[PDB]
Write an enzyme that holds these catalytic residues in place. Structure first.
Site, PDB file in Angstrom:
ATOM      1  N   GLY A  27     -20.966   6.557  28.392  1.00  0.00           N
ATOM      2  CA  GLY A  27     -20.562   6.288  29.746  1.00  0.00           C
ATOM      3  C   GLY A  27     -19.507   7.230  30.271  1.00  0.00           C
ATOM      4  O   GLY A  27     -18.735   7.766  29.510  1.00  0.00           O
ATOM      5  N   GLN A  28     -19.499   7.434  31.577  1.00  0.00           N
ATOM      6  CA  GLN A  28     -18.485   8.277  32.180  1.00  0.00           C
ATOM      7  C   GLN A  28     -17.964   7.659  33.452  1.00  0.00           C
ATOM      8  O   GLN A  28     -18.673   6.919  34.124  1.00  0.00           O
ATOM      9  CB  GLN A  28     -18.955   9.716  32.399  1.00  0.00           C
ATOM     10  CG  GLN A  28     -20.373   9.918  32.870  1.00  0.00           C
ATOM     11  CD  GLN A  28     -20.721  11.392  32.920  1.00  0.00           C
ATOM     12  OE1 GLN A  28     -19.844  12.252  32.783  1.00  0.00           O
ATOM     13  NE2 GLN A  28     -21.996  11.695  33.113  1.00  0.00           N
ATOM     14  N   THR A  30     -13.868   7.342  35.911  1.00  0.00           N
ATOM     15  CA  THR A  30     -12.515   7.864  36.280  1.00  0.00           C
ATOM     16  C   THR A  30     -11.643   8.135  35.017  1.00  0.00           C
ATOM     17  O   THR A  30     -10.914   9.176  34.991  1.00  0.00           O
ATOM     18  CB  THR A  30     -11.883   6.908  37.313  1.00  0.00           C
ATOM     19  OG1 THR A  30     -11.763   5.642  36.670  1.00  0.00           O
ATOM     20  CG2 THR A  30     -12.740   6.745  38.538  1.00  0.00           C
ATOM     21  N   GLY A  32     -12.495   9.128  32.080  1.00  0.00           N
ATOM     22  CA  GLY A  32     -13.064  10.216  31.286  1.00  0.00           C
ATOM     23  C   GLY A  32     -14.471   9.881  30.844  1.00  0.00           C
ATOM     24  O   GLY A  32     -15.321   9.463  31.644  1.00  0.00           O
ATOM     25  N   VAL A  34     -17.005   8.666  27.499  1.00  0.00           N
ATOM     26  CA  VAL A  34     -17.182   8.063  26.176  1.00  0.00           C
ATOM     27  C   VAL A  34     -18.538   8.495  25.675  1.00  0.00           C
ATOM     28  O   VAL A  34     -19.523   8.210  26.333  1.00  0.00           O
ATOM     29  CB  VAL A  34     -17.039   6.545  26.180  1.00  0.00           C
ATOM     30  CG1 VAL A  34     -17.330   6.071  24.761  1.00  0.00           C
ATOM     31  CG2 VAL A  34     -15.647   6.160  26.649  1.00  0.00           C
ATOM     32  N   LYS A  49     -13.754   9.147  22.955  1.00  0.00           N
ATOM     33  CA  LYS A  49     -13.304   9.101  24.360  1.00  0.00           C
ATOM     34  C   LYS A  49     -12.450  10.301  24.709  1.00  0.00           C
ATOM     35  O   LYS A  49     -11.423  10.495  24.111  1.00  0.00           O
ATOM     36  CB  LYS A  49     -12.511   7.850  24.616  1.00  0.00           C
ATOM     37  CG  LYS A  49     -11.906   7.836  26.005  1.00  0.00           C
ATOM     38  CD  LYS A  49     -11.522   6.458  26.381  1.00  0.00           C
ATOM     39  CE  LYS A  49     -10.153   5.975  26.035  1.00  0.00           C
ATOM     40  NZ  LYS A  49      -9.785   4.847  26.949  1.00  0.00           N
ATOM     41  N   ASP A 151      -3.648  -3.685  32.726  1.00  0.00           N
ATOM     42  CA  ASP A 151      -4.852  -3.277  33.450  1.00  0.00           C
ATOM     43  C   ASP A 151      -6.108  -3.989  32.925  1.00  0.00           C
ATOM     44  O   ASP A 151      -7.187  -3.466  33.035  1.00  0.00           O
ATOM     45  CB  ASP A 151      -5.005  -1.742  33.412  1.00  0.00           C
ATOM     46  CG  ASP A 151      -6.041  -1.206  34.407  1.00  0.00           C
ATOM     47  OD1 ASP A 151      -6.326  -1.857  35.430  1.00  0.00           O
ATOM     48  OD2 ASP A 151      -6.576  -0.109  34.159  1.00  0.00           O
TER      49      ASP A 151
HETATM   50  C1  LIG Z   1     -12.619   2.911  28.974  1.00  0.00           C
HETATM   51  C2  LIG Z   1     -12.950   2.796  27.525  1.00  0.00           C
HETATM   52  N1  LIG Z   1     -12.139   3.199  26.551  1.00  0.00           N
HETATM   53  C3  LIG Z   1     -12.855   3.026  25.410  1.00  0.00           C
HETATM   54  C4  LIG Z   1     -14.080   2.454  25.655  1.00  0.00           C
HETATM   55  C5  LIG Z   1     -15.087   2.059  24.656  1.00  0.00           C
HETATM   56  C6  LIG Z   1     -14.737   1.759  23.352  1.00  0.00           C
HETATM   57  C7  LIG Z   1     -15.729   1.426  22.459  1.00  0.00           C
HETATM   58  N2  LIG Z   1     -17.005   1.293  22.794  1.00  0.00           N
HETATM   59  C8  LIG Z   1     -17.256   1.598  24.084  1.00  0.00           C
HETATM   60  N3  LIG Z   1     -18.555   1.419  24.429  1.00  0.00           N
HETATM   61  C9  LIG Z   1     -19.158   1.455  25.694  1.00  0.00           C
HETATM   62  C10 LIG Z   1     -18.804   2.501  26.511  1.00  0.00           C
HETATM   63  C11 LIG Z   1     -19.356   2.618  27.768  1.00  0.00           C
HETATM   64  C12 LIG Z   1     -20.267   1.682  28.205  1.00  0.00           C
HETATM   65  S1  LIG Z   1     -20.897   1.790  29.863  1.00  0.00           S
HETATM   66  C13 LIG Z   1     -20.048   3.070  30.610  1.00  0.00           C
HETATM   67  O1  LIG Z   1     -22.333   2.048  29.727  1.00  0.00           O
HETATM   68  O2  LIG Z   1     -20.600   0.554  30.501  1.00  0.00           O
HETATM   69  C14 LIG Z   1     -20.677   0.646  27.393  1.00  0.00           C
HETATM   70  C15 LIG Z   1     -20.108   0.528  26.122  1.00  0.00           C
HETATM   71  N4  LIG Z   1     -16.370   1.983  25.015  1.00  0.00           N
HETATM   72  N5  LIG Z   1     -14.181   2.415  27.051  1.00  0.00           N
HETATM   73  C16 LIG Z   1     -15.261   1.790  27.817  1.00  0.00           C
HETATM   74  C17 LIG Z   1     -14.775   0.495  28.484  1.00  0.00           C
HETATM   75  C18 LIG Z   1     -15.906   2.767  28.836  1.00  0.00           C
END
Ligand SMILES: Cc1ncc(-c2ccnc(Nc3ccc(S(C)(=O)=O)cc3)n2)n1C(C)C
Ligand SMILES: C[As](C)(=O)[O-]
Length: 351
Positions: A27-28, A30, A32, A34, A49, A151
């Site tokens: 996922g991407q 604001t 950054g 992942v 990340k 947050d």
């Molecule tokens: C902001 C942040 N900091 C660390 C994470 C984080 C940590 C561990 N696992 C995941 N997994 C995950 C990521 C993105 C999506 S998505 C964009 O398809 O919804 C769904 C699952 N992410 N993240 C996330 C909340 C983006």
């Protein structure tokens, strides 16, 4: 598959990068980007990340993740690695990268899958997720940790619906607070911002996280954010519209100058949620109100909220997730640091 050694900012970073393989983008946004990757030594799925740091604010993601990594808390992400990479579109930019375990979904997306197909999430999933989210802040707010996330929102609450597990992440905005030291009141997504922050107070407590958690409990049962203002005052109007206008003493305590709004009688939770099939709605709504108290000190603290009768069925081995799976083994597995600060009544109930 291999991470590109040429993107390492330095030798330490090239060596950390060599521990991991990249599978794909997860996922991407604001914050950054992942990426889903694997630790080559264990096969473990990791979230890699790339942290975008807003220079107008203090980013504490690495230092807070390092402090939490000592605990191994089942509802908080565990740092595995950090390293620095050169930017994709401009190689003069250098980015922090933090690596933690991968969790397949957000609470936002998991709930939105239900609401979009015209179903509220199963009550037992809301309940087990809430228990874990409250446990995560319980851990952050310990005197031995003293971390205010500031947050918390459905978008950084991670869940695995299949096994009913939940982890809190996204600590860039987090900070250890002191009653002696001042902070920035404009933190948090507006919809999850506690009244003391709406009022611009620079001195505030870890109770701001309790408000955010209450807001999320409501959103899990409603399908959209419960307090949706267009601005700080809009936000207070929406809170007062739903909860009712607090007394003048309460408003004077919250207003920093200690010296202005419609006198709403507030909406009963039953008219907000319209959920007549929720068998323990009374308990659910008592808990929600106990988290959503105007005055920070009045809000129910995490370890007391874990003992709330809403959570009684999570103690029953007969209780199952919606796919018939057992509840997560770690629900009632507490760290020594948690247990040694509990009251005798909380230990009796939870441990
Ligand atoms: C902001 C942040 N900091 C660390 C994470 C984080 C940590 C561990 N696992 C995941 N997994 C995950 C990521 C993105 C999506 S998505 C964009 O398809 O919804 C769904 C699952 N992410 N993240 C996330 C909340 C983006
Ligand atoms: C400016 As601050 C509240 O992140 O120390």
């Amino acid at each position: 598959m291999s991470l590109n050694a040429a993107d390492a900012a330095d030798e330490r970073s090239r060596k950390e990068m060599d521990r991991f393989q990249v599978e794909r983008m997860a996922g991407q946004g604001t914050f950054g980007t992942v990426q889903l990757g694997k630790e080559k030594s264990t096969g473990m799925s990791v979230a890699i990340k790339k942290v975008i740091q807003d220079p107008r604010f203090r980013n504490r993601e690495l230092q807070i993740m390092q402090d939490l990594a000592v605990l191994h808390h089942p509802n908080i992400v565990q740092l595995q690695s950090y390293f620095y990479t050169l930017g994709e579109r401009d190689r003069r930019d250098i980015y922090l990268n933090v690596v933690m375990e991968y969790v397949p979904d957000t609470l936002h997306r998991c709930c939105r899958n239900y609401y979009r197909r015209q179903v509220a999430p199963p009550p037992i999933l809301i309940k087990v997720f809430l228990f874990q989210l409250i446990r995560s802040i319980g851990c952050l707010h310990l005197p031995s940790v003293n971390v205010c996330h500031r947050d918390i929102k459905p978008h950084n609450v991670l869940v695995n619906e299949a096994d009913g597990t939940l982890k809190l992440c996204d600590f860039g905005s987090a900070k250890k607070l002191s009653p002696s030291e001042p902070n920035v009141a404009y933190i948090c997504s507006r919809y999850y911002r506690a009244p003391e922050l709406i009022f611009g107070n620079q001195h505030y407590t870890t109770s701001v996280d309790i408000w955010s958690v209450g807001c999320i409990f409501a959103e899990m049962m409603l399908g959209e954010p419960i307090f949706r203002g267009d601005n700080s005052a809009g936000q207070l109007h929406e809170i007062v519209r739903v909860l009712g206008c607090p007394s003048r003493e309460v408003l004077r305590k919250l207003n920093p100058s200690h010296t202005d709004l419609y006198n709403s009688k507030g909406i009963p939770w039953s008219s907000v949620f319209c959920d007549h099939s929720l068998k323990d709605a009374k308990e659910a709504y008592d808990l929600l109100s106990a988290l959503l108290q105007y005055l920070p000190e009045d809000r129910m603290k995490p370890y007391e909220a874990l003992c709330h009768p809403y959570f009684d069925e999570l103690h029953d081995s007969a209780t199952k997730l919606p796919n018939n799976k057992d509840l997560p083994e770690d629900l009632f597995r507490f760290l020594p640091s948690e247990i040694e600060v509990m009251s005798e009544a909380q230990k009796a109930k939870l441990v």
